[PDB]
Design a protein around this ligand. Structure first.
Ligand SMILES: [Mg+2]
Ligand SMILES: [Mg+2]
Ligand SMILES: [Mg+2]
Ligand SMILES: [Mg+2]
Ligand SMILES: [Mg+2]
Ligand SMILES: [Mg+2]
Ligand SMILES: [Mg+2]
Ligand SMILES: [Mg+2]
Ligand SMILES: [Mg+2]
Ligand SMILES: [Mg+2]
Ligand SMILES: [Mg+2]
Ligand SMILES: [Mg+2]
Ligand SMILES: [Mg+2]
Ligand SMILES: [Mg+2]
Ligand SMILES: [Mg+2]
Ligand SMILES: [Mg+2]
Ligand SMILES: [Mg+2]
Ligand SMILES: [Mg+2]
Ligand SMILES: [Mg+2]
Ligand SMILES: [Mg+2]
Lengths: 94, 138, 123, 83
RNA sequence: UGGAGAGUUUGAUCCUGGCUCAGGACGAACGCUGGCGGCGUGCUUAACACAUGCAAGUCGAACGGAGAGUGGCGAACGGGUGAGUAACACGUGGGUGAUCUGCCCUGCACUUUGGGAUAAGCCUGGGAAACGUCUAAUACCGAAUACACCCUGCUGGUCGCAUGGCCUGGUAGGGGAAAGCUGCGGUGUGGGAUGGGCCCGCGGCCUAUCAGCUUGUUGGUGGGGUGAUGGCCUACCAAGGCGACGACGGGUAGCCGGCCUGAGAGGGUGACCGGCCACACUGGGACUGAGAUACGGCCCAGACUCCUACGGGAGGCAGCAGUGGGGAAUAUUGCACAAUGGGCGCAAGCCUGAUGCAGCGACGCCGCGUGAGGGAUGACGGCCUGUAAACCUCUUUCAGCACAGACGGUGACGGUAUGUGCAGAAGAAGGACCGGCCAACUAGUGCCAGCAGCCGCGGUAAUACGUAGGGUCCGAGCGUUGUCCGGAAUUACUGGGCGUAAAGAGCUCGUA
RNA sequence: UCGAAGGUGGAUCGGCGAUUGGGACGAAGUCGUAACAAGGUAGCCGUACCGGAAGGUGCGGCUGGA
């Protein structure tokens, strides 16, 4: 129904994604409902997410896509929503 | 495009007068007219005197620095050195004469290159003619 | 005018005259060669000017001026057509590109080469 | 063609003949109601409402007629019956 | 937070007033000429016709069976093009007490009970080709139960913006469903989220050489109808609606965020990228469904083209490649699902010409290379040049061959970018213009040959033509045509005029 | 019952057309000399009739008339 995607806004051989809430039907670079966060070309991948909005959209029932579900599990908004004891604490930059 | 004494001989200093000061300013620093056009349009966007910003941008060029540094005689001699990559900037190979160094930029030389590492304290003001070249355009 | 008089009827733009109508908003246009002849020019100018009638693919027939010195152009040969006036000849507003398609470049020409389509001789 | 369209053509013959049958059965039920009302026959027409209003909402339960349509039929029959 | 001008009517002058130049750009095209990287871009004309392969399949945790076949979801999304449309189509604003929503999650209650068939499989006919008898299911069906829910009657309170809403209001009548097999599901009903649908306020091209148009037309009442309000439709009464603030006609047109220009206000355009609309050979339908202009569905009618053993059939690139035409002009019948998005499945996976990339074209915007020092009585050579070369050392970016080699059980890009090594200048410069405007000057042809953006140059000494030197200006580009804005206060709202320059109706009366 | 397409008197819009009418530009070859000076009869406006052609003459007007 509603789904948390990634959308490829970069130049050639240099992708930058922004983590977008949208419909399943929409084209990849289409209209979002809301831009939550952003996110792979770094020694440490750059991941930023609004923790408040992620809990809202997951609480409604926005299904994460498979590679976004990794990023939510890393940063630990998935474990706040699910309520399982793995908790949060990851990332850094440098 | 690289140009590759007489061109200076016509000007001296080795609309009639306007073009001649631009011509020495261009063929001194070894710039092509399209690149010289770009530095003017950046200079007028910046604050202060629009003419005085132009000489700051031309003096900032990495090969110009070599000429001032005196590592290589004759600004055209440094073109042969820089593009060949002998020089280094913050531990990175700059193979580019158009590199404009900012404040706190560390220019070292590569190991070998056998034929002394001076630092940039700020971008120098005009004290360290522009009003012809400003009145040339626009 | 009064400002109410502008509200009733506005300010019309002045109607623009299109310059070269036969080309139909294209830079070049092909065509056959239906006559080849000479004319005397207008004015204190005097000479023989080579001219040709070209039916364009656009199906419009108009005079053209062959630039350069001497030409092949026989009857029923295919010819590009440029634009740009020759002001001695009255009416004549098009030109035939030289060295393109059938129209061969001018012989022995070593200066202003690009305009006349002469290939550079052996470097 | 070439596709699984060949399968979904075979379904749309099957599933039409189901829905055509139920839609037609509602018409004859609703038709026979109105002839009872226009006669001035109260006790027969009062029975035929509970016959038809049963049959309408069962067709909504199939997923044929859609419940808002099924409701607005039952509303029209009951307001006809009261007079 | 920015607003230049110049030439040309005359013997000369001032004004009015066109025409032409300097500037910036482009989905560009031609010539002459090209060395490689990075990065976007590429049928604007014929919505012209299409040969070939691929562009939507998937599940054996539903089912017989032994790939095909029934069944469930998907196929309405993704992608294409601009024909149509001057309209609630679009752009911004609201309204929905006038309504729908599969999948998704997250409350509550249930998943009771029985039957009848039909493909596959066998045996027939039909033909070049291709589309009569049996057995299962989460296929399809009689019931039961459900008090949430739908319908009708009588009545309580409150809210207000009138129909009316809401409190699952309280009552008492009548009715609504389902599926099971190895952890996923299935019906009903509250709520939330998504997507829509339908109305209206205003906004946005040309035309009166288009002045009248309308009869389901404008309204009402009772019915039909839709998810829903409505002449949406239909039967009877009423006689109204729209228009000088441009109705009804004719022409052109996808609309917009934007993009080019300008100091602005404006003018032009709607490429790529991102929304909304319409259409899928041409027209008219409906079916299935939660949802349909249903590209790669169905039916009928037409136009056009293929196969044929002449009995019969089949098909529509405005998917991606590609082909032929038309054009001054626009690309490979590429690789891969590794990455992000989507569909199905419990999952492993399996599809994806979406997408990520590669090739090709200087089509555009950037960035680097073609050498760096020293070098004179200034060799020779060409013409009335040049510290350049000659010649003395030197550096090796890109190109060349070698070795290592990616960041994003396994990567298309790719043995690629990239680094470290071996020598040697070796493999690398064009194109315009030089009468004045507007940077740069001197030596065959005779008003012929020719040049030219406007002045105007050629009728025997040419800084203007044709060639050779010498110089400028730009340089992997340089010139020329085509188009739009500017200069243009030259449609003037900002910002003009009308005695004689173009411009006061011949004069008065008077409706809007 | 509605209903595409296909059948068989006007409205609007265009292509070709024997032939014919004026316009522009070109060389200037004939026929004149109408306008600019009282241009050798002041010129021009509005009609009217006439003439190879510029033009001529009536009626009223005007100064942009010596
Ligand atoms: Mg009703
Ligand atoms: Mg003069
Ligand atoms: Mg219209
Ligand atoms: Mg469904
Ligand atoms: Mg159109
Ligand atoms: Mg202006
Ligand atoms: Mg059709
Ligand atoms: Mg239906
Ligand atoms: Mg197709
Ligand atoms: Mg389909
Ligand atoms: Mg194609
Ligand atoms: Mg203007
Ligand atoms: Mg004026
Ligand atoms: Mg008057
Ligand atoms: Mg004719
Ligand atoms: Mg006279
Ligand atoms: Mg006289
Ligand atoms: Mg007179
Ligand atoms: Mg007479
Ligand atoms: Mg008189």
């Amino acid at each position: 129904a509603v789904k948390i995607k990634l959308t490829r806004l970069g130049k050639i051989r240099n992708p930058q994604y922004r983590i977008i809430v949208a419909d399943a039907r929409t084209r990849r670079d289409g209209r979002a409902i809301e831009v939550i966060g952003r996110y792979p070309k770094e020694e440490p991948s750059l991941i930023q997410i609004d923790s408040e909005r992620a809990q809202y959209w997951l609480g409604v029932g926005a299904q994460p896509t498979e590679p976004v579900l990794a990023l939510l599990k890393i940063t630990g908004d998935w474990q706040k929503f699910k309520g399982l004891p793995g908790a949060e604490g990851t990332l850094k930059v440098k | 495009a690289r140009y590759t004494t007489r061109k200076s001989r016509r000007l001296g200093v080795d609309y009639r007068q306007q073009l001649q000061e631009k011509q020495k300013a261009r063929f001194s620093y070894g710039v092509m007219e399209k690149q010289f056009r770009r530095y003017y349009e950046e200079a007028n966007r910046q604050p202060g005197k629009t003419g005085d910003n132009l000489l700051r941008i031309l003096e900032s060029r990495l090969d110009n620095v070599v000429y001032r540094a005196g590592l290589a005689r004759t600004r055209r001699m440094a073109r042969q050195l820089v593009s060949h990559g002998h020089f280094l900037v913050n531990g990175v190979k700059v193979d580019i004469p158009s590199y404009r160094v900012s404040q706190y930029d560390i220019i070292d030389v590569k190991e070998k290159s056998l034929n002394q590492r001076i630092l940039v304290h700020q971008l120098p003001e005009r004290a360290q003619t522009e009003q012809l070249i400003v009145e040339l355009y626009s | 005018p009064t400002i109410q008089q502008l509200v009733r009827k506005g300010r019309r733009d002045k109607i623009a005259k299109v310059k070269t109508a036969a080309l139909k908003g294209s830079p070049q246009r092909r065509g056959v060669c239906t006559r080849v002849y000479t004319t005397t020019p207008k004015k204190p100018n005097s000479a023989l000017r080579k001219v040709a009638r070209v039916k364009l693919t656009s199906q419009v027939e108009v005079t053209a001026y062959i630039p350069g010195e001497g030409h092949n152009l026989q009857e029923h040969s295919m010819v590009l057509v440029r634009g740009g006036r020759v002001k001695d000849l009255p009416g004549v507003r098009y030109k035939i590109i030289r060295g393109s398609l059938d129209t061969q470049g001018v012989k022995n020409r070593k200066q202003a080469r690009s305009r006349y389509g002469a290939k550079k001789e052996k470097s | 063609n070439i596709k699984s369209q060949i399968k979904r053509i075979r379904t749309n013959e099957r599933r039409r003949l189901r829905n055509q049958s139920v839609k037609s059965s509602l018409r004859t039920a609703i038709r026979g109601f109105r002839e009872a009302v226009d006669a001035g026959d109260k006790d027969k027409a009062s029975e035929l409402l509970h016959a038809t209003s049963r049959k309408l909402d069962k067709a909504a339960s199939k997923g044929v007629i859609h419940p808002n349509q099924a409701a607005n039929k039952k509303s029209a029959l009951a307001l006809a019956l009261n007079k």
